[PDB]
Amino acid sequence: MQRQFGAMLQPGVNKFSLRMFGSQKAVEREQERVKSAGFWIIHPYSDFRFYWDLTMLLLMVGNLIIIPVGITFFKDENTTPWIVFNVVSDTFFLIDLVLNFRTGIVVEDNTDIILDPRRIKMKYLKSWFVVDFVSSIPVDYIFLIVETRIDSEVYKTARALRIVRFTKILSLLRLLRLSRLIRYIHQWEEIFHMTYDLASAVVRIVNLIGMMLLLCHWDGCLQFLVPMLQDFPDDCWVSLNNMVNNSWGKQYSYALFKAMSHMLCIGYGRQAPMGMSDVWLTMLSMIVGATCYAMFIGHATALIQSLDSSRRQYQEKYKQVEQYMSFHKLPPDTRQRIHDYYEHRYQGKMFDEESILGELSEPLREEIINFNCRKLVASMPLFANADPNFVTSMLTKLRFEVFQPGDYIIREGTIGKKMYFIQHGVVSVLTKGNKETKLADGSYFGEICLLTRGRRTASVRADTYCRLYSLSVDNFNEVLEEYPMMRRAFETVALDRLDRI
Amino acid sequence: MQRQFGAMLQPGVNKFSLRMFGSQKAVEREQERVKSAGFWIIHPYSDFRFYWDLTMLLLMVGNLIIIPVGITFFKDENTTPWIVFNVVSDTFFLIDLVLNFRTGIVVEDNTDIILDPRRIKMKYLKSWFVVDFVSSIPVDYIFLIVETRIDSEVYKTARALRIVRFTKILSLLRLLRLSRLIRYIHQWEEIFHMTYDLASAVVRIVNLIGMMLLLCHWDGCLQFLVPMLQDFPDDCWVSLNNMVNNSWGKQYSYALFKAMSHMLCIGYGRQAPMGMSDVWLTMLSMIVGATCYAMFIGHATALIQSLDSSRRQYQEKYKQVEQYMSFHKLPPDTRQRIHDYYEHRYQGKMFDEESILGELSEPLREEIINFNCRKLVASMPLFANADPNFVTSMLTKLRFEVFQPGDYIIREGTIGKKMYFIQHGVVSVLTKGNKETKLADGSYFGEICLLTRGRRTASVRADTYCRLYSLSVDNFNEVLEEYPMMRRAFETVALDRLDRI
Amino acid sequence: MQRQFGAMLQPGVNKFSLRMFGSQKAVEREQERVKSAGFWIIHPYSDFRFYWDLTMLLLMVGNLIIIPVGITFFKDENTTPWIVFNVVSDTFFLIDLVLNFRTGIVVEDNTDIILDPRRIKMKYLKSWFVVDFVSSIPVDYIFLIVETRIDSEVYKTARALRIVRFTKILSLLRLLRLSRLIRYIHQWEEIFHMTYDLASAVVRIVNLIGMMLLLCHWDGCLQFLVPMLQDFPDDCWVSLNNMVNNSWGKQYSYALFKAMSHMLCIGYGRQAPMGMSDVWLTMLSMIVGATCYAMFIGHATALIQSLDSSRRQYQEKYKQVEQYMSFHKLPPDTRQRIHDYYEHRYQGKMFDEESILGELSEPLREEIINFNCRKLVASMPLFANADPNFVTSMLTKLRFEVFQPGDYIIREGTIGKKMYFIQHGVVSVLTKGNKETKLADGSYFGEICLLTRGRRTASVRADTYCRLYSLSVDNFNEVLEEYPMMRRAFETVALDRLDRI
Amino acid sequence: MQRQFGAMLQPGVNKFSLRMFGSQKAVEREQERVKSAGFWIIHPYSDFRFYWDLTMLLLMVGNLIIIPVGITFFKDENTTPWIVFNVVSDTFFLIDLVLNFRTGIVVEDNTDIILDPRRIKMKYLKSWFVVDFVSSIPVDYIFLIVETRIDSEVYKTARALRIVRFTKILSLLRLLRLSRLIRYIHQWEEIFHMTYDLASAVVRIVNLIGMMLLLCHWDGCLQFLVPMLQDFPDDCWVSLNNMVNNSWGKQYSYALFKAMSHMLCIGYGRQAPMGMSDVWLTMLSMIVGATCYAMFIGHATALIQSLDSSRRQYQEKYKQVEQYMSFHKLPPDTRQRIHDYYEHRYQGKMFDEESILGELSEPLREEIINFNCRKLVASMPLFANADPNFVTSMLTKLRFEVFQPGDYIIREGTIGKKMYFIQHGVVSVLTKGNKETKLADGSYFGEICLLTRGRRTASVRADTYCRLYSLSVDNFNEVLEEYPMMRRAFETVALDRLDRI
Numbered sequence A, B, C, D: 001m002q003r004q005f006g007a008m009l010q011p012g013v014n015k016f017s018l019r020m021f022g023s024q025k026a027v028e029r030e031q032e033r034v035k036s037a038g039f040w041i042i043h044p045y046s047d048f049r050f051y052w053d054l055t056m057l058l059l060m061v062g063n064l065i066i067i068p069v070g071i072t073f074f075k076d077e078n079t080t081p082w083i084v085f086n087v088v089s090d091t092f093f094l095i096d097l098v099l100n101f102r103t104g105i106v107v108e109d110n111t112d113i114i115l116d117p118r119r120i121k122m123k124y125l126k127s128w129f130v131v132d133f134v135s136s137i138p139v140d141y142i143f144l145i146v147e148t149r150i151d152s153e154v155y156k157t158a159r160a161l162r163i164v165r166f167t168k169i170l171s172l173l174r175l176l177r178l179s180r181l182i183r184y185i186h187q188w189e190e191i192f193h194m195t196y197d198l199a200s201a202v203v204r205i206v207n208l209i210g211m212m213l214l215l216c217h218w219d220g221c222l223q224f225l226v227p228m229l230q231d232f233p234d235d236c237w238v239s240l241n242n243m244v245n246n247s248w249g250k251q252y253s254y255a256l257f258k259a260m261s262h263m264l265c266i267g268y269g270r271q272a273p274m275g276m277s278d279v280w281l282t283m284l285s286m287i288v289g290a291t292c293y294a295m296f297i298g299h300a301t302a303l304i305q306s307l308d309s310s311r312r313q314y315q316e317k318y319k320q321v322e323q324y325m326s327f328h329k330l331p332p333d334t335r336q337r338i339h340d341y342y343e344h345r346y347q348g349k350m351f352d353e354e355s356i357l358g359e360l361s362e363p364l365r366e367e368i369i370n371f372n373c374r375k376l377v378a379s380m381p382l383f384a385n386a387d388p389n390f391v392t393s394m395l396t397k398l399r400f401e402v403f404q405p406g407d408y409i410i411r412e413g414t415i416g417k418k419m420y421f422i423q424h425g426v427v428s429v430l431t432k433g434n435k436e437t438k439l440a441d442g443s444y445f446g447e448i449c450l451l452t453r454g455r456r457t458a459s460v461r462a463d464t465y466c467r468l469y470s471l472s473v474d475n476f477n478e479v480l481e482e483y484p485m486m487r488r489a490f491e492t493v494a495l496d497r498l499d500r501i
């Protein structure tokens, strides 16, 4: 077959493809650019390249841990399970090197992804090739075959000891697969959606901890490699501590201890570096370790300063309220009422509701405000018998207000400018020469003055912690010009009060 | 009786209940949902659940300190005061496990608190049950009864030593009460109002210090437990230091030292971990300790950057003023006057007075501005003989201005746009062809040009550090259309000057 | 005399007095409230209390360094120069205790400073009295006189050794003068103007370094005091190190080393605390030292993040410009021109010129803008022959614009909306059917279309990096209604071009 | 010749000269102020002073490394290659001292650069002269000639040992060239354009690392100098460690270790400072090292908090969206749609497009918006047949909107206020009593209601993730008054629908 593997090479339809391209037709035009780019070409957003590069991450983390251990702590390991492990690993890192000449390269300077196989070839050779070519081919296994052709007797003389010390240096060229480890994680963590939705301070602090553990692991093997290459001199940490003929569990464990002590800021065990090699390795690990630890405090600080923001923003605003009250020296009763205001108005979290609504689409501002005001719509007798466009056009105009008990919301004998809807609590309409009356959750007041452009006719005073909704004059005249049929309903209720008045 | 205990199960009336629900009637509807939820059901905001969970915090902090000490440092403690201490403690952690099936669960996805006892049951079993069931029942005391039924002779053989080493591992299942310690502090610190009013950087840094001391205490017992379970091998820190047969005061004290050295970044006393157990415990404590210490620097930095904000905001603004003056290379006399401006205008603290007033309710902006301008109202002869709505409608329009001596506030022969009230100091009305005259604290100028829409008639020049109040034209015409009776008083005073002119 | 000392008790006239009170008359009313408050009363802002509390800072820093040294490191020092040093010091700390009942107390809840001597007395006894009464009287010298009356033979028995160990504990009550050290620095650093003008991050980091050196000095004496009070046990750091009979230079030096090692995160010299006293002192100093060091990183971070702000603000804005250009994938030539824009428009520092001007007084916006545009005023032939109010009313309207070479500033055949003044460089007026002409620094263009409300008549194209000034139509019509005499001058020049046209 | 060297003394024409002065003529006036300032005067921005001060940076870094090494670790080095190295170095630091009296001094208080050679002379002597005069002349080589004249026999007695210990103290006066190292880097890093374009957090952290390595290098020589000047006492670190007669490779290496341990927070190798000199040097290096390390954490934190800003700003906004949705307890379907909104509207990066465009010049807003809308212009049939000023005046008015599928963009029977252009996807015009029809990328809807000022005539419902462009009424009436010829084209298309209707 030739069809079913072409579906893996071209970017399929999911959420990511849509996000990258817009409509589904833009993906369908992209899926035809893959097939028209030549035979057997890989698109980088496709499902093959995502699940190929996932298996290479599970192979590099295998070979960046097992390789620097099996070179040092085993003084001769050329058994069958080890060489097969290196040949199988060298197979995938050649196939990965082959498939990089067929993968499209994302250019951050144009809107196109290059799928011409020659332009892919000329960009890969210039930027990351030799680091991915040295780490691909088995360099150590070539050199033993080449030195076999150079000299047949290179296994008997005193040169043979130098070659084996030269061989383990060449097999550390396979640690250049960190360059493919780093690139295939930055490309993975953006595409993978659960890491794309995490905060960037959480993502970078995981990449650091994965790097601090890996550098401490390589350093732990390097504290044992450099004395081992020097045939364990009589001043090296390994000799004095008498760790030449222990198991490879302890050697590595003690070496990891020394590296972690040098890095994490602790002091080594009274073995003041006494040999030049040891002094310069410890000074290497002290500088490397204290730099990675100071970058760990930098990420941990940036993570903490973006944990709990709204509350921070509520308290930073209220601290400016507190210092404003002491600058003008308010009485402590008015300081108590203003502190009773913010925890009843804002309830501990301060959002900027105007911008959060305004960035959204209209069809979503109509949906949120129709959800936030369901306790007002279902309780009022006005809104259950109205046009649903009228209800949505009303609720977008309102603004939320809080009045403490004892406050005069409307003073009689002023010019009216707002209309009030009662969400919570009861108020007291105080009438000149008549009995006071209460209004409940769902009654509305402040409409007589807006229909006549006159002055206020009665006092309104809060009794509970009333949470009201305000409607200005300019919005009230604008809504009725759209819907003149709902104008007469307010004229009916305003006829009733002026009757009672 | 059955009545008086029902008053503890339902949420009573206080500030917290009102804050959570709004009006008192919303609490009264909530108190009937408790009684209609079945027999003997606990509401989580009620006064029983607050003072039950306060006693459990005073019991868990007892049992998360005494239990990890009395297991390790006492090689056999099955006396009467110890077992009674564990049976009494296991009674409350079963009753706490029973009462969790009757407490309402706060859902952060709906507006309702579930009080149906079956839906409480099906949520508690899924999230935090087995951690609260293992830590509830005495697991170690069951296993001795079970092993008694398995083998009657399990106290004489060499298996008996293995069982006692197996017994102390099971009694460390009681350290899972940290999961109930953490949950019952987050629920406590939000309800308790003196911790709800503290900053979140102060709250999280207390929870960290309580956790750093507890982890250092468990680590201090763990440095002694793991050698004790291994029958004190001849390489363990305890042997070399010769601390096998000291008092349990020293054993614990020396162990706490070792843990604090490993954590707080210091180095241990020349005892380079020489036994695998000791190497991996020290490496455990170095990673745990340096992570908690780096999080301590992160909270201490976030606390310091939100200590003194206004002044920070005054100085960050004035540093932008300083660099603006050096960018344009002002003369040093004008740099001196502008530095004399900010400390007389702002006095070292810079508030944003417009937003701090604007977030409040109108009945509070009328109360603050009527307090801030009492020195202006009581000193002017205008305001003591006026309507109190007129005084409040005037004072909401004014804006605060500062003029240094020598400055010309009003130049003669321009178009007038503002009116001035004198709070502090004296000015000099310079008249074309007449003698200069002074105006004092409470006189007002700049009203002749607003009544006639003409041009300026005289010069006004500052003599002291005058703090004035400004009133624009558009506000001045608006206030007089409300109150035309106060229009004639300004016409009387403007008749006097033009007479003197 | 009784007059000349009254001038020290009342707050004199300087910059600070004026800043605290406003006009000089407000100081003169304050100077009469001092004299009318009773006989011999101290005002806290006066020149006596400033220079009294300056000498006490130079005495407390003497006695918080010399006292904790001379108690410990001298096993018996009751010589004449030592006791005279303590009696002279105890004289000033009684007089300072007497003068605190006559100093006015600043209340942060009212606008008044209390000068009633009874209300001063009732506030001082409640808040800071016993800490200033214990540290005032010589407590150790009383106890030797009292024990002389208790038992005449208290110098011969074995009780006499216990009394001398009890005596040095009582003389450490004089370290409560830190409470007067801290209060008299917070009151000093606000009044002293060179510390009031420093940043608060610079002030708090100096108070910390003064506290870290003092805590390390007390800790250095405490590492030697507690073994000295225990008669130097055979496990104490002093014995093992063999420092019992050295000079008091070394004892103190070695002790300061140990304290600094425990605090600054280093490890002590192989002397793992081997005595309970030593373990709990080292654990005391490790917690105290690592807490003060973590607060040092917190202040050093907050200092660095407010060093270089404008440039930070220029680069944080331009980084948003850089990521905006790569998000839309601009060509690299347009990326080069936009990078050439910001360094010619903003020149590396980005100020918010609108708010920095707007917070100032008008008489200062008239003075700065008349300084920033002196190269425009002196070079134009228009402004040197005009009214100085007209020049100031023109320059407040202008806005600053930058055009790169090749740009078309004005395209012929559009509706004109702005007028241009040339500060730097030359432009090319391209005329339909006529020869191009240049305009120099001080010529102006874009006024023909504003006098006729017609359309554009010619093209204008930049040749150099022109820095222009823009004047809108609405401002241009407004200025000419004030000054109609300068309207005809632009009509003359517009007559010339239309002649040449 | 005298001409060709004058071209190096005067500031040439490049980007920096233009940035500092404006137009090229302003440079040409500056190049004549150099020649008119006297004979042979150096302008500080010129190409001679840039490449002179670059060679001195490559000489000071030579002599601040080689000098503190060759003094200490060589107990007598007066060979020919050493003295020639000091005489050649003392030649350039005299010529650099001579050329500082001819270089113009930048004054941060005026707009002029002083080129009068007397005012250059009187400013250099007051600020940085004696530090540049002591470090210039060979002070040690004078003192041997002077002491030769004082006493001819000063080489034989016991005074001769004191003179050689006095000689190495005088040759450390050459470390005052750090004052010329610091000044010539701040002047270099501003002029050099690749360091002027880096962030200031990146620049200051490189200057710190260059200072931390240099202070650790001087400290490493100071740990060996002070015992060497004291003839290696029997308690000094050098003796006990037995490092008196090793090579100068080890001496220096071991000393650098000790300094780095004291600074980087590690502990020294069991050599608890046992000699007063050693105690006070270690305490010197602990305070110096922990201060430079705490400043390293401060810069590393400030670097991390300005790495990835836009995404931070996208996520900090969306976290406020997340907490707003849980505060009002939205259903999880509406939480899913709003999360589908932001990643389709903003695509993970949130720019403030209004301010980023508004700070630019008009000729650049015309160029960017003509680039961002090329997919709209080339696809619509309207824009390919229009005036290019009309296309640019249209595209500056549009605003970008996103509608999810199922949303009703336009509801039939409302008042029309906007016009829509389709960039991506298809919509469904739902017609009362007629068949639905689709519109594609480049068709436009919402123009019938704007030409008649009537109400909406049909429903429009989204089908894909439509990215639209909005055009308001007030902008639509304004553009047609400029171009009435394009008014009739929309009237033609609106005639077609009302025909189909």
Ligand SMILES: Nc1ncnc2c1ncn2[C@@H]1O[C@@H]2COP(=O)(O)O[C@H]2[C@H]1O
Binding pocket: A410, A416, A429, A431, A437, A444, A445, A446, A447, A448, A449, A450, A455, A456, A457, A458, A460, A497, A498, A500, A501
């Ligand atoms: N007699 C009354 N009974 C009930 N409500 C009243 C009475 N008089 C006034 N009101 C309400 O008080 C409001 C004050 O503002 P309006 O006059 O605009 O509208 C008025 C009514 O809503």
Ligand SMILES: Nc1ncnc2c1ncn2[C@@H]1O[C@@H]2COP(=O)(O)O[C@H]2[C@H]1O
Binding pocket: D410, D416, D429, D431, D437, D444, D445, D446, D447, D448, D449, D450, D455, D456, D457, D458, D460, D497, D498, D500, D501
């Ligand atoms: N019959 C129709 N066929 C196509 N488009 C239509 C039809 N009726 C209305 N429209 C479009 O729907 C738009 C709704 O707003 P307008 O009436 O302003 O302009 C209208 C046209 O763009």
